[PDB]
Design a protein around this ligand. Structure first.
Ligand SMILES: Nc1ncnc2c1ncn2[C@@H]1O[C@H](COP(=O)(O)OP(=O)(O)O)[C@@H](O)[C@H]1O
Ligand SMILES: Nc1ncnc2c1ncn2[C@@H]1O[C@H](COP(=O)(O)OP(=O)(O)O)[C@@H](O)[C@H]1O
Ligand code: SF4
Ligand code: SF4
Ligand SMILES: [Mg+2]
Ligand SMILES: [Mg+2]
Lengths: 271, 271
């Protein structure tokens, strides 16, 4: 068995920082994990690899001729805790569908046998400002079984969570893609945890963890590390360990019930 | 003559608040303006119309049969200062290209003669987290002659500015789409103005205005108004008037010079 999780959310909300720190905590626990970057920014694996970023499947396929000239062992790279890392890439801005590289990457990984029985988790880090093209592919094509949405008390972040939830509903008749929870990545506003708990309740899910805003994140990332590796004693390291434990133990996976714009505004009004 | 401007930027950065307040200041000055919403959130005209949002061209076309059954005078709605407003709409999440409604809307407006000689400005409010499909159409198809990018000291906002700039470069051999400037929408961090001035200089443009963070914006928008209408005496109203004056007077329109990720990180490091 292997659990396939996808982290969605609006741009800049904290998907890649949260995913890489969660995954480092899983590896610290002894789990075997692969991260698949599905955001054109292509920096979803840099903190595991200690790297600038990672060269993408689209880039490597072009340098090699075709994607068939690539071998899995030349594309997947291991970093902290043995976590295996790959980046999809995407076309340059203004040409082609920004999500086209996700389709190529996921099909390549499936065909080349990357989903070996010994992996415990796969995490996809997916752009969520639009739910279409290759960014909808993990949902449409049944790859992202458990979706976790990173969000905050920001209206745009909550709207994005509702939009992703609508995409999950639209494919509910095929496959098994479900909403696993919301992750609140704090803006250091109070009642913010209560706000995201309320939103999760209205959608029919739960807020799995509240991640505090902590400057140790920046100090770690300047050095191309997760907090888990940079300062294993940090309070924020323990926050990521708690998030990872709760993902492991989570049993609530639902077809969410998206809300109206009036419900979303009323939530912000109240809190 | 009529100037065609497009406001791009990452989600939640302030495009719609900045555009509607800028446009209200233009109308207060006596200009005739149309706003074309090109973001699926479809709330780009609500502060001019005093409305919840606006029903979209895609929605109205479906209720009416075809887009040809729609008349311009039934779709365009006037609000504060006579500003004319239209929303593109888009398909539901998980179906079709999130930008498909922009193509339908802009072609409809062109064919129906919405670009009447007496308009002074058209502003497109465009999602900028991906530059593809209908969101690239204003650049690819020469509709958005002057692009202004709303951004902030946030790394993701600056990355989005660089991505949009790359899209402008890619179509530089056809049409006349150019970068007009950056608009800094403050996160209330200091040296932030100097940071965005530096980024503009590296791209070859200018930072046209620094918009402060001011709670009067929220108090206005709770009442579905621009600050210009809600409190014409407010300091923030004068900030939007200054931005509008500088857009009117702006003569610098360039093919930008996108920067590397190393240059972008060095900028953040320094400031
Ligand atoms: N809990 C946190 N505390 C402090 N900084 C954070 C936190 N989460 C994210 N950040 C910072 O926010 C910025 C954006 O996060 P990132 O994970 O890259 O967003 P995304 O992948 O959603 O675009 C990064 O500079 C990151 O270091
Ligand atoms: N200068 C500002 N001061 C205070 N709040 C602002 C300012 N600019 C934007 N906001 C708030 O930020 C939120 C997002 O702005 P919006 O224009 O809707 O973003 P976008 O259209 O880019 O998604 C809105 O609640 C808006 O009221
Ligand atoms: S939104 Fe990107 S290509 Fe359809
Ligand atoms: S990114 Fe949306 S459909 Fe191509
Ligand atoms: Mg990311
Ligand atoms: Mg908007």
């Amino acid at each position: 068995a292997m659990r396939q999780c996808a982290i969605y959310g609006k741009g800049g909300i904290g998907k890649s920082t949260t995913t890489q720190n969660l995954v480092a905590a899983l590896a610290e626990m002894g789990k075997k994990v692969m991260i698949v970057g599905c955001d054109p920014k292509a920096d979803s694996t840099r903190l595991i690899l200690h790297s600038k970023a990672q060269n993408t499947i689209m880039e490597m396929a072009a340098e090699a001729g075709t994607v068939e000239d690539l071998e899995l062992e030349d594309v997947l790279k291991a970093g902290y805790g043995g976590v295996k890392c790959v980046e999809s890439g995407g076309p340059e801005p203004g040409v082609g569908c920004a999500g086209r590289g996700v389709i190529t990457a996921i099909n390549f990984l499936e065909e080349e046998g990357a989903y070996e029985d010994d992996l415990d988790f796969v995490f996809y880090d997916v752009l969520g400002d639009v739910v279409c093209g290759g960014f909808a592919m993990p949902i449409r094509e049944n790859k992202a079984q458990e979706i976790y949405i990173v969000c905050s008390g920001e209206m745009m972040a909550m709207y994005a969570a509702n939009n992703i939830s609508k995409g999950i509903v639209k494919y509910a008749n095929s496959g098994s893609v479900r909403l696993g929870g919301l992750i609140c990545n704090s803006r250091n506003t109070d009642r913010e945890d209560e706000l995201i708990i309320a939103l999760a309740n209205k959608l029919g899910t739960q807020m799995i963890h509240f991640v505090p805003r902590d400057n140790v994140v920046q100090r770690a990332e300047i050095r191309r590390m997760t907090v888990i590796e940079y300062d294993p004693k940090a309070k924020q390291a323990d926050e990521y360990r708690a998030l990872a434990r709760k993902v492991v133990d989570n049993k609530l996976l639902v077809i969410p019930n998206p809300i109206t714009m009036d419900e979303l505004e009323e939530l912000l009004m109240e809190f």
